[PDB]
Design a protein around this ligand. Structure first.
Ligand code: A1IR3
Length: 164
């Protein structure tokens, strides 16, 4: 069912995350981590202290889909185990901010065709698929977007709830 998911999303904040490729989303799904550029790192750290849940909704560039969504479990930190991200041309690992721990809520994909009825007030009511990395998605739009994803029966939200 969807009741524990709705509980996790209650009064959450939501951010669109772009990945240049599928490899980085695969690494994020396996290791429970993400890293963004410093401008977005500052926004996410502020949000993490501001709200009961901060949800990252992932989309690989040019894929026409979202690849899942996850909840921040920490502010960003430096000096942890190395992660062999595959970054875009002209970007080095030193340009990244720190590493956020994340707990995946759904590792299933959602094609953009299924979200065409949702618009984001914080991006001029453009379709929610449209946005730069780090674009905040307003609560109602973000909640409805997450509820569109296929249920991920491999995930037990009981432990995620205990972190809130
Ligand atoms: O492409 C990537 C790949 C990553 C991986 C470390 C996780 N993190 C990012 O933030 N980007 C990004 C998105 C939009 C604009 C500039 C960079």
């Amino acid at each position: 069912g969807t009741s524990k998911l709705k509980y996790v999303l209650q009064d959450a904040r939501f951010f669109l995350i772009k990945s240049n490729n599928h490899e980085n989303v695969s690494l994020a799904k396996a290791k429970g981590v993400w890293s963004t550029l410093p401008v977005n790192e500052k926004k996410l750290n502020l949000a993490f202290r501001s709200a009961r849940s901060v949800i990252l909704i992932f989309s690989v560039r040019e894929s026409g889909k979202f690849q899942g969504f996850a909840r921040l479990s920490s502010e960003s930190h430096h000096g942890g185990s190395p992660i062999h991200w595959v970054l875009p041309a002209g970007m080095s690992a030193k340009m990244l901010g720190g590493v956020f721990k994340i707990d995946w809520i759904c590792r299933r994909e959602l094609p953009f065709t299924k979200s065409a009825h949702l618009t984001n007030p914080w991006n001029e009511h453009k379709p929610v698929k449209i946005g730069r990395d780090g674009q905040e998605i307003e609560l109602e739009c973000g909640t409805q977007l997450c509820l569109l994803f296929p249920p991920d029966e491999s995930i037990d939200l009981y432990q995620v709830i205990h972190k809130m």
